[PDB]
Design an enzyme around this catalytic site. Structure first.
Site, PDB file in Angstrom:
ATOM      1  CB  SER A  75      73.081  31.806 101.057  1.00 49.75           C
ATOM      2  OG  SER A  75      72.319  31.781  99.792  1.00 49.75           O
ATOM      3  CG  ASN A 116      71.934  21.641  98.119  1.00 46.67           C
ATOM      4  OD1 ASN A 116      71.603  21.648  99.221  1.00 46.67           O
ATOM      5  ND2 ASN A 116      71.591  22.438  97.280  1.00 46.67           N
ATOM      6  CB  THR A 162      71.686  27.184 105.635  1.00 47.43           C
ATOM      7  OG1 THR A 162      70.522  28.093 105.128  1.00 47.43           O
ATOM      8  CG2 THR A 162      71.060  26.729 107.022  1.00 47.43           C
ATOM      9  CB  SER A 172      72.886  25.258  99.272  1.00 44.24           C
ATOM     10  OG  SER A 172      72.373  24.974 100.558  1.00 44.24           O
TER      11      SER A 172
HETATM   12  C1  LIG Z   1      71.981  30.347  99.237  1.00 46.96           C
HETATM   13  O1  LIG Z   1      72.360  29.238  99.842  1.00 46.96           O
HETATM   14  C2  LIG Z   1      71.116  30.471  97.932  1.00 46.96           C
HETATM   15  C3  LIG Z   1      71.752  31.448  96.976  1.00 46.96           C
HETATM   16  C4  LIG Z   1      73.239  30.899  96.879  1.00 46.96           C
HETATM   17  O2  LIG Z   1      71.063  31.367  95.880  1.00 46.96           O
HETATM   18  C5  LIG Z   1      69.821  30.791  98.283  1.00 46.96           C
HETATM   19  C6  LIG Z   1      68.929  29.937  99.203  1.00 46.96           C
HETATM   20  C7  LIG Z   1      68.831  30.622 100.352  1.00 46.96           C
HETATM   21  S1  LIG Z   1      67.234  30.308 101.012  1.00 46.96           S
HETATM   22  C8  LIG Z   1      67.108  30.899 102.835  1.00 46.96           C
HETATM   23  C9  LIG Z   1      68.229  30.009 104.022  1.00 46.96           C
HETATM   24  N1  LIG Z   1      67.794  30.150 105.181  1.00 46.96           N
HETATM   25  C10 LIG Z   1      68.490  30.328 106.544  1.00 46.96           C
HETATM   26  N2  LIG Z   1      69.631  30.340 106.836  1.00 46.96           N
HETATM   27  C11 LIG Z   1      69.395  31.816 100.427  1.00 46.96           C
HETATM   28  C12 LIG Z   1      69.651  32.683 101.307  1.00 46.96           C
HETATM   29  O3  LIG Z   1      69.505  33.932 101.527  1.00 46.96           O
HETATM   30  O4  LIG Z   1      69.934  32.084 102.521  1.00 46.96           O
HETATM   31  N3  LIG Z   1      69.775  32.059  99.057  1.00 46.96           N
END
Ligand SMILES: *C(=O)[C@H]([C@@H](C)O)[C@H]1CC(SCCNC=N)=C(C(=O)O)N1
Length: 357
Positions: free
Chosen positions: A67, A340, A313, A315
């Protein structure tokens, strides 16, 4: 070799002391940590990009950043906005005519840029082509009105990037790999890794410690497509702090800065254009408590600030990434890992490293 009183050695001691235990405790095979401070850059590599046959992490190792990819879609939308091609306040169906008469008459581009449309996190697995995607979107209704709640959404980020790219007359993949990343000088950053770089593409290791790479599905480039080096992401952090000449691209600097505009508050967190921020100095507790919620608009929007902690963040099934930077201190950190591991640990380690500087 270690040298007392030398910048790179002092920072390395701090980073080693936190990253080596972090990797052991989480069984993380490999990491790269990049730090910028006082206009100088420091890159530290640890462990293995792949286990069998073993390959070390090097300056060229590519990691999936998940993300974090959403910040590139936001930067592209911002570039389209400052270029006069996109208005964030306009409706999604204004720019996507097939959705006119649907719920997207009442969802703004800003909503999909701030996770406030109400679209769910994950694209449904059976959506394979644009026709199926448009049929889904034309028939979709949220339980709450757009603009009322924050729900992190890969679908919303997909629409943000698609609309931004179309407003520039190109596909998203073209906009990112031919316009945005080249103008940022990020030459080792990709949505699709080329053949000469596959040897540098780390394997991710999932919860069962199986080697994995992310599978790219519809609108996935916008939400999770980027593979990159810590050095390229540190350049991106510096560019976000106005530190680089950037080939005299004034519009691109304005685009980067404008993604830091604060549009909604949720809890203690300010939602920018994909980036999230907190007032600086930050205490670790509020950082940790920050990781549907009610979304309160900030109107007029909070202009891009110096005295804030800006972070994101990201992942995938096999990777965990984090960026944080403080413009007032011209300091920032990129932490990339091929496993992760929990976000609380990412933010704690970053906080301890930046605090030491
Ligand atoms: C991003 O990492 C995954 C996506 C690739 O499926 C998901 C989980 C996260 S949840 C929020 C993180 N909080 C603060 N930075 C997201 C995202 O939009 O960050 N999408």
């Amino acid at each position: 070799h270690h040298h007392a009183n030398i910048d790179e050695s002092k920072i390395k001691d701090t980073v080693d002391d936190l990253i080596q235990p972090l990797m052991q405790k989480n069984n993380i095979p490999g990491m790269s940590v990049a730090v910028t401070v006082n206009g100088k850059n420091y890159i530290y590599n640890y462990g293995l990009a792949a286990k069998q046959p073993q390959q070390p992490v090097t300056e060229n190792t590519l990691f999936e950043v998940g993300s974090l990819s959403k910040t590139f879609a936001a930067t592209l939308a911002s570039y389209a906005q400052v270029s006069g091609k996109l208005s964030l306040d306009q409706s999604v169906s204004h720019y996507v005519p097939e959705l006119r008469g649907s719920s997207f008459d009442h969802v703004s581009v800003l909503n999909v840029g701030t996770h406030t449309s109400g679209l769910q996190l994950f694209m449904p697995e059976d959506i394979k082509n644009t026709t199926q995607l448009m049929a889904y979107l034309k028939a979709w209704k949220p339980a709450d009105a757009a603009g009322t709640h924050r729900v992190f959404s890969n679908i919303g980020t997909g629409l943000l990037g698609m609309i931004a790219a179309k407003s520039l007359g190109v596909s998203y993949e073209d906009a990112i790999e031919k316009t945005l990343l080249p103008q940022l000088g990020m030459h080792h950053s990709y949505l699709k890794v080329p053949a000469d770089q596959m040897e540098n593409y780390a394997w991710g290791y999932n919860k069962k410690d199986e080697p994995v790479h992310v599978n790219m599905e519809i609108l996935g480039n916008e939400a999770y497509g980027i593979k990159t080096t810590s050095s390229d992401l540190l350049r991106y952090v510096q560019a976000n702090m106005g530190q680089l000449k950037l080939d005299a691209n004034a519009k691109m600097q304005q685009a980067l800065t404008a993604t830091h505009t604060g549009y909604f508050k949720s809890g203690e967190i300010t939602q920018d254009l994909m980036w999230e921020q907190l007032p600086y100095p930050v205490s670790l507790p509020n950082l940790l408590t920050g990781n549907k919620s009610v979304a309160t608009p900030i109107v007029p929007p909070l202009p891009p600030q110096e005295n804030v902690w800006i972070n994101k963040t990201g992942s995938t099934n096999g990777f965990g990434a984090y960026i944080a930077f403080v413009p007032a201190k011209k300091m920032g950190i990129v932490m990339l890992a091929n496993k992760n591991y929990s976000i609380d640990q990412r933010v704690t380690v970053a906080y301890k490293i930046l605090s030491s500087l």
